[model samples]
Target: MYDAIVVGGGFSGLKAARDLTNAGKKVLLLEGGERLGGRAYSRESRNVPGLRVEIGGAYLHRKHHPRLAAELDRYGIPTAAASEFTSFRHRLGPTAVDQAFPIPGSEAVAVEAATYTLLRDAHRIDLEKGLENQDLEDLDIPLNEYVDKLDLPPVSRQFLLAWAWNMLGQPADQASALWMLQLVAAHHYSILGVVLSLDEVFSNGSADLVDAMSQEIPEIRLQTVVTGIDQSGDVVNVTVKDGHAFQAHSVIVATPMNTWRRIVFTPALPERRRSVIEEGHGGQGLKILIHVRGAEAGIECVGDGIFPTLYDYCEVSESERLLVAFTDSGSFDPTDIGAVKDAVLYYLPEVEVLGIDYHDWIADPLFEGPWVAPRVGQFSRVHKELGEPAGRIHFVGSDVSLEFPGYIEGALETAECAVNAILHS
Candidate 1:
């Protein structure tokens, strides 16, 4: 029997497999998809001009993620700053804004209260502690509810609403306020800090990091869809799609809760642990990479209309630019190219499309959605219970992380935590 069977070959699974193998323990990493890296991976566009199109979780917050920062450095992965790529706001003709995008407000107070509200609350959160440590769940209502408590003006309310939708991939009113605060803290703690931290993407892309992690793994199985797991005393029987079974002393269940609903457990997961899957943790959205010829310079649009988020990512050539666009499920129609063009035309009128590119993450059955951002009551209710292991089965994912949750850093942090727990146990 192997020391462990890691189901789901995302960053968290890959990292756990790497650490376990490094310790000279016998382990097998199984990926449902043909490729690894899960959500944070990239795709090489055959016809597209740019180097690679990042499908999900592109940027890396430079300052905070120490372990990830060191790993990137050790591997010699290159990085480019967002400062090098000039950013402009969409409305009012794409204004050239720094960290502080000027917003209008009250008659006398002007634009001060809106930005101040974002700053004031960030001062209160403990990023490392996350939701479980404190009563931060007081903000467990909708993000709109929290913004209402702040009593923001039109300029501020619209901006926060767009930002909440764009970043978390969910509407502010639906997204958990505490989860939103956790996300802000992960990005250096503030609205502006979050904007500025969108600065660096892995120079080669997320696949480079995942590929590096995979180099030392003891064993890995691709196209291995784990259907069921049953633990008996110490050994656990993990069944794959093809009637093949693997026995392991321990199992790390790293797949998303959305996908986890399909898998059966012999002894069954504890109520607190399995409840997250039943409650639902992630938001739904489509991430698309558009190759446009007319647009120049980097652009960021926080729009309430059609596409809530649009941005210029990397330069494909001197004349053409590779742009990344995000749309929530309700407003998006992947088949209609005109809707995409119309959305871009509003912010970037000069944009002329060469072609539209995307991996269709929403359609990909292996991954039901892009990322997890728990809803209003879910945070305080299930935050501490998220990764709580049941017997030999442990859970780890970006969804379950405390620090840097919902980002690559969170995946790395949670992976390290799960690996340590197993190694010491």
Candidate 2:
């Protein structure tokens, strides 16, 4: 039997495996896909030579993630802050405002001011006591209702919604308010000094870091989909899709919340845990990366309306540029390349697009929804219980992180926490 079985090859799983192995523990890392890095994996675009595009989690800001920086340095991975020539395109009805703003600076001020306000209020909530005393059955309430109760202004409400959507891939109305505050706190603490572009952040690719972290450790079995887990006393038996069983002293479930619903626990999860899965996960959102051959660089756009909220073109290489676009499921059709191209052109009328490709995390079973964000009551009800380890089964992922819970930095932080917990336990 191995000392531990990590049932996901994402950053958290790799970190767990690496730390455990470094401590001279026998560890087995299992990945459902063909490679590691869970949602942060990247692939070389068929169109661009020596250029790669990330499909999942990308972008790590040095100010936000010191541990990630240390890990990258340990692996000799070099990084550059996202390009400074960031621009924004705001679609005002039929007209578009292609404005160039000091992205890092403007964003920093806005986020910092907003975060300060959130923290000031959060300190008064007594989060742990709220969770301990709250009712888990009230999980189905909408987040907008709770926010309305907070008596925020229309602009503040909209800004919070946009930020929540960007972070958790869900609209504000759908998430829990308490969860939103927690997310606010997480970002306030983690992203204090990081500067990055949407394109260059995690430019080395998260998979590369995962590989570096897992190097020299036990072999990780790929294309292995775990279906069930049986934990009895100290030994945990994990069953994969192909009737394979792996035994280990403990199992770390690093899969997303949606996937957690599919797996059958021999002893079953607690009522609160079951409520989380059954109440449903976050809504769907799509992220698309387009290679604009002739398109001008440093174009950023935001829509006055929600769908096609933001689109920006940053220089990916000397000869080519990358366009990163985000849209809600209700508004954006990712598969429609022409629609995306038109949207891009709508913002930057002078720019010409060469090619377009997109990926939808919401459509993938591996990540049924986007990142985690609570509506209103969710933070007070489910956030704490979701991360609690059950017997030999431990939970670690960006979703469970106390800081920056939806970003790559949060993933690294949670991974470190899980490793420490296992080592000290």
lDDT of each: 0.75, 0.66
Best by lDDT: 1
* Model 2 agreement with the true structure over 318-344: per-residue lDDT tens digits: 666877766666566766767876777
Candidate 1 lDDT tens digits, 1-425 = 79999999998888889888988899999999898988886877744734676778888766867867877887788776653545655552233233235353232263366456666666577765547567765777787778787765555566667767877777666777777777776666756666666767776788888888888886899999999999955689999998599999999988875687778898987776577677566576667777788777766666556677677777778888778777676457766888888888877788797777776665567877677777677767667576778788988888778777777777888888889889997
In order of appearance, the predictions have TM-scores of: 0.90, 0.82
The C-alpha RMSD in Å for every predicted model, in order, reads 2.8, 4.6
lDDT measured at residue 299 in model 2 versus the true structure, 0 to 100: 59
How much is 182 displaced in model 1, in angstroms?
2.0
Could you tell me which residue pairs clash in candidate 1?
Answer: none
TM-score of 1: 0.90
Q: Residue 363 lDDT in model 1?
A: 58
